[PDB]
Amino acid sequence: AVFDLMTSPFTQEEVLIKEIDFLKNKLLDLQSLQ
Amino acid sequence: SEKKPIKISADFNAKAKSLGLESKFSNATKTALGDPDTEIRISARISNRINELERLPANLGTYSLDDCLEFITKDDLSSRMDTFKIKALVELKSLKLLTKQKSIRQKLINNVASQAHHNIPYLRDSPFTAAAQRSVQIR
Amino acid sequence: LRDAYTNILHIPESTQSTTVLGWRRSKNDSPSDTSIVYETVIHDNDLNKPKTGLSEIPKEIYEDVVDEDVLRAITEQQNFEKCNEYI
Amino acid sequence: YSLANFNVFQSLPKETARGVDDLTRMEMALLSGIPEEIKWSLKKYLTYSNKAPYMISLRTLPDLLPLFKTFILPLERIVEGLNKSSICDSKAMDSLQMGLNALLILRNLAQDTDSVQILVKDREIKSFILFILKKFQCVATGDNKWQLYEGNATFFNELTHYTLDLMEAISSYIAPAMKDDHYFQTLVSILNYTKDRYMVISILRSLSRLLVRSKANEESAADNLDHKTLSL
Amino acid sequence: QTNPVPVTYPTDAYIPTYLPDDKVSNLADLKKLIEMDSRLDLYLTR
Amino acid sequence: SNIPDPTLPPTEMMTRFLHPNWYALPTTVWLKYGNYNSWAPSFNENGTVVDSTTRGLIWLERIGYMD
Amino acid sequence: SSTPLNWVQGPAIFHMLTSPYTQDEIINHEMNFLKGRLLELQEITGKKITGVN
Amino acid sequence: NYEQEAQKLEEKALRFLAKQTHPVIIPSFASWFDISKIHEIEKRSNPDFFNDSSRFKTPKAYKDTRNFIINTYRLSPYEYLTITAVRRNVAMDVASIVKIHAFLEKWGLINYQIDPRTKPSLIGPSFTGHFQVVLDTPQGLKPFLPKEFPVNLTIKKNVYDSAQDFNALQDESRNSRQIHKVYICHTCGNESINVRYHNLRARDTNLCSRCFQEGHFGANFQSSDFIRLENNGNSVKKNWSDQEMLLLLEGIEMYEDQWEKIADHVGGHKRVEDCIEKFLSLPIEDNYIREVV
Amino acid sequence: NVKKEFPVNLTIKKNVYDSAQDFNALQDESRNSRQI
Amino acid sequence: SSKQNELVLQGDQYFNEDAARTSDIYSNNNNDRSLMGNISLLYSQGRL
Amino acid sequence: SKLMECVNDAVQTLLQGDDK
Amino acid sequence: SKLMECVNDAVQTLLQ
Ligand SMILES: [Zn+2]
Structure with missing residues (x-):
């Protein structure tokens, strides 16, 4: 895995929540594929 | 010689060969080191050399013929007594660390091949590699 | 003169050089001799003839009132400065 | 041993120790114009659009779409010049590949609500999509004006696909299509022509989304559906 | 069956439309035959 | 050391090595809809490197004329 | 700054050693990576996930 | 005649030449920049100096100001170069000074904050050659001459073995034998001088020359267990002796x-x-592979 | 804008055909019955 | 196109266990040093 | 594969001329 | 050798 320091008007918490949402949807899609 | 020197037919293996591209449709080329016979032979030679090196004496000084200018008085130590001993040790240890060199070499080769399409320009810039790298990233 | 605002030396700009006239590159003596030889060089094409602002006067000024020889001299001076701006 | 061993150098932040955050690096690299930096930043932007599109959403990062448009319009010129052998040089190939990468990035972002909302409010992108669709229609109906040179077909292929995806998205935001709508005619021509399946399903979705709020008595786009298309 | 069973040999091919209509004079007949074949297929399957 | 003797198998390096120049790029799919379904999408070329006709020509040259 | 920004340690991006250009090996390694990252982030945050298999 | 002229010219040019001490680091996207030219990116980001709008804003003034700022930063790249110092030295309107300073800072041309002790060093494609940066000759140093007179002098030279040496600004002169190493006899505390007797079995204990002459080692070791090695002998770069190769193999x-x-x-x-390179490129097995095939 | 070969340490190796010509340091005092 | 395709077709010739097992491609005397030059980076990444 | 070098040189010479 | 001969003969026949 790679981590890239960045900057945004969000905070770490909201970014982690958005990552959780996106990864959950992506895993659901990959599971539904098979 | 006088007529057309190509004479393409419907074989595609003679057609491809006559225009230069013969090995360019096979996955990997043919080499000699891929057979167990040659491997056993090379291993036999290496084991024989290591045997010969290990059967040498430890006290293996060398008279260098330039010790004349170093007026040794039977108490001094010659500054070149260990020159054949050092070479024998170097060759023996290098022959005993062969698999380590092989492992590091194959690690280097794998880690430089996996990044061919990202580090080599004429491979990174072909339309097919670009198209494939785009096709992987289709959301 | 050491200035204190920036804590840095100040020498008359004349002693310093102005621009950089490109680069030059060559090879080592032997292959596999992976070394770098970085070095500076000054170039002074025709150090005898001084430079003036003559490369700035437009043609529509000196033309039509000049002798042929003076026109050739003007052209020579301008071309000389323009070429001295090269490597 | 080293002048870094001063007490003053004991309080440095962790944010600058690398030099520049990668978002800023990619933006400045695209701003430069150096081809190597352009290619590096475009690969990274594509990876981000595929695996983390919420970090580069066209809303939170304004002035991101103008750069992609600068990379995309020369693609329009090239595609117009694509009916003959015209990629002889390597700079032409590089510009074409940059255009394709920017187009794929735009499509991946358009897969989101905010990004597609920002994309719809842009005349340049819609005009480019329409241009590519009219070229595809010219290929489909077999017109003698513009005939694709097969040596370039590969490029065109990829192009078309991306465009259609974009259309699909924006098809939701042009919902009531009027009588003489070029999008509808282009799409029905391509639908009658193509043998791809992904393409057929995308075109059907796009057509079903261009008929959301339309009246039966009022003259609408549904009058551009001859009996051939309905039978199909 | 609910899926079209991906296979290994090509199942169809486009017919080129960039040939000159003057020189090639039997493309129209081939396209007419293709249309009639499609119509027969529709009728049978229905 | 833990380094083995140089005569102990294995002794080959590139026994399972794969260069990216042979990585099986994506191509067309060639679906098949029954036997009397001719008005049907035959291909599925979404993330392909090369278009349908060129893939067909490759197949024709290398496979179709193998006999 | 009229828009106050923060230092945000970004999300982990999937990076495979050998990129095989096809979807089979990619999807296998990617499902593994997704599950691992979901577990890591669930350990980091005070939350729970649904559908993790 | 002209020989002495060129000699004095080289002397004067070298006396008044800025000697570099600290390395300057700029981000890669700022590679279009040249100190003596103006780029399109600078004209787009600063349209006021070139659109011929004002007389106080000329391209010459912009170039002089930005060159002042660049030189001031490069001469001491560890400090920050606040705006107030520049404003006290330059004679422009404060708005223009601020715009130029901000533009130069955005592209990392000045005030680029890194900690360069956390990143590796690489080698670009352009490498391994003689590079001659040719800069114009300074006036006020030309000779006084009360036929042509071309000049292509060379002021100072620097040699580097690797790219890391180039980045660290370390020349072969001082780098060759910068510091030393101390060995100590395992039996007496005295340090061995110019030579040590390395134990081939212990691989950690070295002996004095005298304690080896007199057999002052353990009673389970024989004199054949020791080997004579040198201490102060450093080999010129890219030259591995047999002692160094043996030590490398023992270390591995x-x-x-x-x-x-x-x-x-x-x-x-x-x-x-x-070390890694020398261990990799080692024809250990070539003879047997060649004779079998 | 050459093939460097591994050293051939010939002084170390032994004669293959007539091993009665090696240096006295390399010979084996076992063919002339001088071991014990 | 011919020049580019020929360049592409010659991108995997020193990957055949013959160039790999012998010390030719690792030698510094090679004018092109696209193989050994990576070492430094590969060492800093710890992969090697 | 040696014939193709001569062919490429011939094509380049063709591109050099004007009335060819 | 003969390859250059054949190539140049072909080019001359093409240009004439
Ligand atoms: Zn001692």
Whole structure:
């Protein structure tokens, strides 16, 4: 895995929540594929 | 010689060969080191050399013929007594660390091949590699 | 003169050089001799003839009132400065 | 041993120790114009659009779409010049590949609500999509004006696909299509022509989304559906 | 069956439309035959 | 050391090595809809490197004329 | 700054050693990576996930 | 005649030449920049100096100001170069000074904050050659001459073995034998001078020359267990002796993958990359492969 | 804008055909019955 | 196109266990040093 | 594969001329 | 050798 320091008007918490949402949807899609 | 020197037919293996591209449709080329016979032979030679090196004496000084200018008085130590001993040790240890060199070499080769399409320009810039790298990233 | 605002030396700009006239590159003596030889060089094409602002006067000024020889001299001076701006 | 061993150098932040955050690096690299930096930043932007599109959403990062448009319009010129052998040089190939990468990035972002909302409010992108669709229609109906040179077909292929995806998205935001709508005619021509399946399903979705709020008595786009298309 | 069973040999091919209509004079007949074949297929399957 | 003797198998390096120049790029799919379904999408070329006709020509040259 | 920004340690991006250009090996390694990252982030945050298999 | 002229010219040019001490680091996207030219990116980001709008804003004034700022930063790249200092030295309107300073700072041309002790060093494609940066001759140093007179002098030269040496600004002159190493006899505390007797079995205990002459080692060791090695002998770059190669092999045998300890066991005067390269390019097996095939 | 070969340490190796010509340091004092 | 395709077709010739097992491609005397030059980076990444 | 070098040189010479 | 001969003969026949 790679981590890239960045900057945004969000905070770490909201970014982690958005990552959780996106990864959950992506895993659901990959599971539904098979 | 006088007529057309190509004479393409419907074989595609003679057609491809006559225009230069013969090995360019096979996955990997043919080499000699891929057979167990040659491997056993090379291993036999290496084991024989290591045997010969290990059967040498430890006290293996060398008279260098330039010790004349170093007026040794039977108490001094010659500054070149260990020159054949050092070479024998170097060759023996290098022959005993062969698999380590092989492992590091194959690690280097794998880690430089996996990044061919990202580090080599004429491979990174072909339309097919670009198209494939785009096709992987289709959301 | 050491200035204190920036804590840095100040020498008359004349002693310093102005621009950089490109680069030059060559090879080592032997292959596999992976070394770098970085070095500076000054170039002074025709150090005898001084430079003036003559490369700035437009043609529509000196033309039509000049002798042929003076026109050739003007052209020579301008071309000389323009070429001295090269490597 | 080293002048870094001063007490003053004991309080440095962790944010600058690398030099520049990668978002800023990619933006400045695209701003430069150096081809190597352009290619590096475009690969990274594509990876981000595929695996983390919420970090580069066209809303939170304004002035991101103008750069992609600068990379995309020369693609329009090239595609117009694509009916003959015209990629002889390597700079032409590089510009074409940059255009394709920017187009794929735009499509991946358009897969989101905010990004597609920002994309719809842009005349340049819609005009480019329409241009590519009219070229595809010219290929489909077999017109003698513009005939694709097969040596370039590969490029065109990829192009078309991306465009259609974009259309699909924006098809939701042009919902009531009027009588003489070029999008509808282009799409029905391509639908009658193509043998791809992904393409057929995308075109059907796009057509079903261009008929959301339309009246039966009022003259609408549904009058551009001859009996051939309905039978199909 | 609910899926079209991906296979290994090509199942169809486009017919080129960039040939000159003057020189090639039997493309129209081939396209007419293709249309009639499609119509027969529709009728049978229905 | 833990380094083995140089005569102990294995002794080959590139026994399972794969260069990216042979990585099986994506191509067309060639679906098949029954036997009397001719008005049907035959291909599925979404993330392909090369278009349908060129893939067909490759197949024709290398496979179709193998006999 | 009229828009106050923060230092945000970004999300982990999937990076495979050998990129095989096809979807089979990619999807296998990617499902593994997704599950691992979901577990890591669930350990980091005070939350729970649904559908993790 | 002209020989003495060129000699004095070289003397004067070298006396008044800015000697570089600290390395300057700029981000890669700022590679279009040249100190003596103006780029399109500078004209787009600063349209006021070139659109011929005002007389106080001329391209010459912009170039002089930005060159002042660039030189001031490059001469001391560890400080920050606040705006107030520039404003006190330059004679423009404060708005223009601020715009130029901000533009130069955005592209990392000045005030680019890194900690360069956390990143590796690479080698670009352009490498391994003689590079001559040719800069114009300074006036006020030309000779007084009360036929042509071309000049292509060379002021100062610098040689580097690797790219890391180039980045660290370390020349072969001082780098060759910068510091030393101390060995100590395992039996008496005295340090061995100019030579040590390395134990081939212990691989950690070295002996004095005298304590080896007189047999002052353990009673389970024989004189054949020791080997004579030198201490102050450093080889010129890219030249591996037999003693150094033996030490490298011993280090690899002892510390299998700890390459810092290996490179220190060889003598420290060789970087780790050289050790890895020397171990890789080693024709250990070539003779047998060649004779079998 | 050459093939460097591994050293051939010939002084170390032994004669293959007539091993009665090696240096006295390399010979084996076992063919002339001088071991014990 | 011919020049580029020929360049592409010659991108995997020193990957055949013959160039790999012998010390030719690792030698510094090679004018092109696209193989050994990576070492430094590969060492800093710890992969090697 | 040696014939193709001569062919490429011939094509380049063709591109050099004007009335060819 | 003969390859250059054949190529140049072909080019001359093409240009004439
Ligand atoms: Zn002692």
